[PDB]
Amino acid sequence: GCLTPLKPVPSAEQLEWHDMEMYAFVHFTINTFTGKEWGYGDEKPELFHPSDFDADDLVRTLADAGFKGVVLTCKHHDGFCLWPTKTTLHSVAASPWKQGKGDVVKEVSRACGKYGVRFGVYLSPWDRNAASYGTPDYIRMYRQQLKELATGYGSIFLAWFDGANGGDGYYGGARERRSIDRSAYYDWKATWGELKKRQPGAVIFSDVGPDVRWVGNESGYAGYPCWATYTPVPLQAGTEPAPGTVRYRLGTEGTMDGKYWIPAEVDVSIRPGWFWHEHENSRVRTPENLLKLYFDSVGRGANLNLNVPPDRRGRIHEEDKKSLAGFRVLLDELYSRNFASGAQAESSSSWKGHGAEQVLDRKRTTYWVAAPEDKHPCVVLKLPEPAAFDVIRLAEPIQLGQRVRKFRVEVRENGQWSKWTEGASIGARVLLKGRPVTADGVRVVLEQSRAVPALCEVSLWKYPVILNAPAVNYDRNGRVTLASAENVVIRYTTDGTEPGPQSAMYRNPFFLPAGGTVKAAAEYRGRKSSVTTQIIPVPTRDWKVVAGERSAAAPELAIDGDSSTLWHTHAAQGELAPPQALEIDMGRPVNVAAVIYTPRRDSSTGTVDRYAVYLSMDGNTWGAPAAEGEFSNIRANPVPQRIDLKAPVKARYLRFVGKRVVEGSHVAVAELGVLGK
Ligand SMILES: [Ca+2]
Ligand SMILES: [Ca+2]
């Protein structure tokens, strides 16, 4: 079955790149040691002194996360080079890292070889230290740097050519603004030709790059359809397309029937900034985020390039490693069971031996092709029994072209077929997520295509369960109800320990008539979730309101357990001013140790700041205040406030006196509770 291709087609190196699916950035240079996202160029190389670098750890941590390549920023915009280049001493050769000089590029490419992951380079065309930048001599220097990187560090699978500029820089002390004709300065054709002479197996990235294109954003999403084909058009009509001179937002979806084959890379950072920042340790993308990113990039037909910036300790930070390990666990669960492996494949037609069955081995080299006859080609998978799934994966033999243009996927439930998902492009691969179904039949219908269609993979998958922390709710009876999105086991503790994997399971609403602390956690297939911790106050069903201004709002709205219900003293007669008091008969002698005041959410009107609480056992003699003070920072942060008693008191009657407020001049209590440890 030697079938006729559909121009354009990818090359062998582009096919390998596609099959990689995903790979990593490592933004690491002197800016990592300045705190800047873009360096100026005046940095002393003294400042590149990573304490405890270790490249094996770096590459291994990335490879365990499933990334198949590492792209190192060998020189970023600041112009400082991570290897002892012969073009400048604004390199590691000047740094105290190592006795004078080591070589980060050598170590990272060596570890990439050590762990079977590809190695690629980023060499910023815009050099902000080279005093020759703007003159042809900088082009000579840049060509020598590219030769050095492409001569002594093994195979390079991708070279990353950033088209971004921005003008000013140190430029060897010039401290000047320089601009270059981006569409002609770097003379890209010859530089890239020489590079691909000494690295025939490499792939060129840039906004136009003859091999891989930029997705046109840095937020981490390609657009569906994300055609691999692409025809760059310039920003300024007439100029010649080049990195930084093309309508780049068009690179988010590609071009329908393009003239060239430049598939898309989704470069995105695990953190807001491309380089390591300490104040971003709390903003590292969660594994669920990274999986969503994986779909919105890989599962749309593009490839993923996640940036993991080593800190200025020279290591991937602990948060980054935690998130990467979680992301690997989630990708592994996603591909635990292929609900198509074991199925039968049928087709509306076939051509010269490429039968339907050929889509079950997931291999991109074996494929089904329809006959140039039926205008509605289709592929049916029949399953051994109804199976629970929600994700389909489709793939084309892209080496023969990209053919599918509009397509749908129908599922068979309860004996009947209904439409489940649809789309436009397939290309390298597409992950379609639909409604969760229990089905034993899948139909892929290729509605329209320019050339006789073909598929190399049809596989079925269950999207991993998002383990959201358990909701812990309670009524005025102490009846506690735990809940979560379905199909999760919930463990819980009431003493104060953390919910270990051997803690009490949740089953039905349980009781806690003393007031305490609940800590719950969700579980599914060995993977845990965040721990919800909730303090349950004492029951309030025997509580009656003994004293409190009624002519405006019913005081029972402050002990009804609903924070969205409001007691106030803002009657149509007047804004009756503080102090406003609530005397509560608790119905039973309670051993109170804390008082909870829940203010209103939407406003700061009526919220109290200075408070007094009296306790008694007859409601007639109160005495000195049982507690006393202010609610510091309740204006900007109106949340439930806790009055811890200096010493626990046993009492039946409680008087809460709001003495004065934050804004307005009536008192407003949303809820009022009591804790008795
Ligand atoms: Ca196949
Ligand atoms: Ca209330």
Author numbering: 29 to 705
Give me lines lifted from the publication on this model.
Although crystallization attempts of both AmGH29C/D were carried out, we could only determine the structure of AmGH29D, the most complex fucosidase structure to date. Unique to this structure is that the GBLD domain is joined to a linker domain and a C-terminal CBM32. The linker domain and the CBM32 adopt an extended conformation, which positions the CBM32 binding site above the catalytic domain. This juxtapositioning of the linker-CBM32 domain relative to the catalytic domain, which resembles a Cobra strike pose, is observed in the GH33 sialidase from Micromonospora viridifaciens, suggesting convergent evolution to a similar putative mucin-binding motif. The GBLD and the CBM32 assume the same fold, despite less than 22% shared sequence identity. The position and the surface chemistry of the putative binding sites of the GBLD and the CBM32 domains are different, suggesting their possible functional divergence. The catalytic site of AmGH29D is similar to the closest characterised counterpart from Streptococcus pneumonia, but differs by being flanked with a flat positively charged surface, compatible with binding sialylated or sulfated glycans at the mucin surface. Notably, shorter and more flexible loops result in a more open active site in AmGH29C as compared to AmGH29D. Notably, only AmGH29C, but not AmGH29D, showed activity on the double sulfated terminal Lex epitope highlighting the overall broader epitope specificity of AmGH29C.
The mucolytic human gut microbiota specialist Akkermansia muciniphila is proposed to boost mucin-secretion by the host, thereby being a key player in mucus turnover. Mucin glycan utilization requires the removal of protective caps, notably fucose and sialic acid, but the enzymatic details of this process remain largely unknown. Here, we describe the specificities of ten A. muciniphila glycoside hydrolases, which collectively remove all known sialyl and fucosyl mucin caps including those on double-sulfated epitopes. Structural analyses revealed an unprecedented fucosidase modular arrangement and explained the sialyl T-antigen specificity of a sialidase of a previously unknown family.
